[PDB]
Design a protein around this ligand. Structure first.
Ligand code: PER
Ligand code: CU
Ligand code: CU
Ligand code: CU
Ligand code: CU
Length: 495
């Protein structure tokens, strides 16, 4: 179902059994995944979130992030708890009111309090482009062509320990999938196609942790969009998709009428496809209603390599073509030790007063801001470079920056930088030990912006820092509504 751009979104508790195992959940809009929030580029989004949660086992507070939306001028609407807001308390509501100038494509939204998105609060967010340059490439782009991949857990998030290796208990494709252990024959999702039609498939990782090797038996996939950024056409037969990443790909329904497995193998949890785990069904209209008996290719000959992607627009790369070729160049020390992650020696632990409120209250420098050692100020209209060398305990870590997308100057498993035409995106795998994944952006968005691993279990274990972009202009750029000012008094009184 699609709702928006002006809509109510109620947040409730509900037991669900997507793999046949009933457990509690935290739901946005009453379903899993949450309904698709949609609009056209330049639309004003007004999302009235009603917190109706009662089950403390998963926290009755909440806060929602519109993942990959820049929120320029509306840093208050961004959603990360204790960075840009206090959580909304149960029985209250809050209006996330923002615009999406300049942006189109495939996004999602999720709880950004603690590990609550794992417990169910996650759904797709699509901004349609009435003049999409990729339009002519396909016949069908709508709610039936969105594909969510989701890790599902039988253990309540709050009780995951932590960390501590944590693994999912099944993979759900469009909200349905089978358990990894003691697999019950529960309903699988179906994606239906018509012989000779081309589909814009919107592949969305709403994962709390694993990356997926995604493929469709018998079929190619032509990537045209990556994390919101239009890409040149790239035909692959497999897609490794890390947590929070998105791809639009054209699926040409050119095979014989029949049933074909859709495969999503996670990097941890259940391996393979026995009994229909890690699976959904591509069915052609006219096929018999039965399980596919198809097989994956023994070897995928054109799997996605990030370095093969290029923006469709002439994005280029800001700054100078050598490492450090930026106004403010950073090299982050990313560590793990004794169950906690650190960025430049500091494990992130959320401050009592949100970073944005701290600034609005009169803080001027990163030194003035809590948590200590967890904030790096950036000056305005400057080219930033962030090298993010891997090595820290598994891994591979998908790093995400709020309020920005970014040129991936260097990708995983490949030590050659690209300063000409690398893909831009918002979530990037930093690869493996010895890698040096490097990103670049410009500071054109004053506000405190979260940079963290999108493995949610890693975020709760402290793998995050805040880029306090243009602290001096933050208050002026982001006027807040009274309801926002009301949040922290409410939260703090209730707790
Ligand atoms: O973005 O989490
Ligand atoms: Cu996110
Ligand atoms: Cu985000
Ligand atoms: Cu991580
Ligand atoms: Cu985030």
């Amino acid at each position: 179902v699609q709702i928006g751009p002006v809509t109510d979104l109620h947040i409730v508790n509900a037991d669900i059994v997507p793999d046949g195992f009933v457990r509690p959940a935290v739901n946005a809009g009453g379903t899993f995944p949450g309904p698709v929030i949609a609009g056209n580029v330049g639309d004003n989004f007004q999302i009235v979130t009603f917190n109706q949660l009662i089950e403390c086992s998963m926290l009755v507070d909440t806060s929602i992030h519109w993942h990959g939306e820049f929120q320029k001028g509306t840093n208050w609407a961004d959603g990360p708890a204790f960075i840009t807001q206090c959580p909304i308390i149960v029985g209250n509501s809050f209006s996330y009111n923002f615009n999406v100038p300049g942006m189109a494509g495939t996004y999602w939204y999720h709880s950004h309090l603690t590990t609550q998105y794992c417990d169910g609060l996650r759904g797709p967010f699509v901004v349609y482009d009435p003049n999409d340059p990729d339009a002519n490439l396909y016949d069908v782009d709508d709610d039936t062509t969105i594909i969510t991949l989701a890790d599902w857990y039988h253990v309540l998030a709050k009780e995951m320990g932590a960390g501590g290796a944590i693994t999912a208990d099944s993979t759900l494709i469009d909200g349905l999938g089978r358990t990894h252990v003691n697999v019950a024959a529960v309903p699988l999702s179906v994606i239906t196609v018509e012989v000779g039609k081309r589909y814009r498939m919107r592949l969305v990782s709403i994962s709390c942790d694993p990356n997926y090797d995604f493929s469709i038996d018998g079929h190619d996939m032509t990537i045209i969009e990556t994390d919101g950024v239009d890409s040149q056409e790239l035909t692959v037969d497999e897609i490794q998709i890390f947590a929070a990443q998105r791809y639009s790909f054209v699926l040409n329904a050119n095979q014989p009428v029949g049933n074909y497995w859709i495969r999503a193998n996670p990097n941890s949890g259940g391996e393979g496809f026995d009994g229909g785990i890690n699976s959904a069904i591509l069915r052609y209209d006219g096929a018999t209603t039965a399980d596919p008996v198809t097989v994956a290719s023994t070897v995928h000959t054109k799997c996605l390599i990030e370095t093969d992607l290029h923006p469709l627009s002439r994005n280029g790369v800001p700054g100078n073509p050598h490492q450090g070729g930026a106004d403010c160049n950073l090299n982050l020390s990313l560590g793990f030790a004794c169950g906690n992650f650190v960025i430049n020696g500091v494990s992130f632990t959320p401050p009592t007063v949100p970073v944005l409120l701290q600034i609005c209250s009169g803080a001027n420098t990163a030194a003035d801001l809590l948590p200590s050692g967890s904030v790096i100020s950036l000056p305005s209209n400057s080219t930033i470079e962030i090298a993010l060398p891997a090595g820290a305990a598994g891994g591979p870590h998908p790093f995400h920056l709020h309020g920005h997308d970014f040129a991936v100057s260097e990708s995983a498993s490949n030590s050659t930088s690209n300063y000409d035409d690398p893909i831009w995106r918002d979530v990037v795998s930093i690869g493996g030990v010895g890698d040096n994944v490097t990103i670049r952006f410009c500071t054109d968005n004053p506000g405190p912006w979260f940079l963290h691993c999108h493995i949610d279990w890693h975020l709760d274990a402290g793998f995050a820092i805040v880029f306090a972009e243009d602290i001096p202009n933050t208050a002026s750029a982001n006027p807040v509504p009274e309801a926002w000012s009301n949040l922290c008094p409410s939260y703090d009184s209730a707790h």
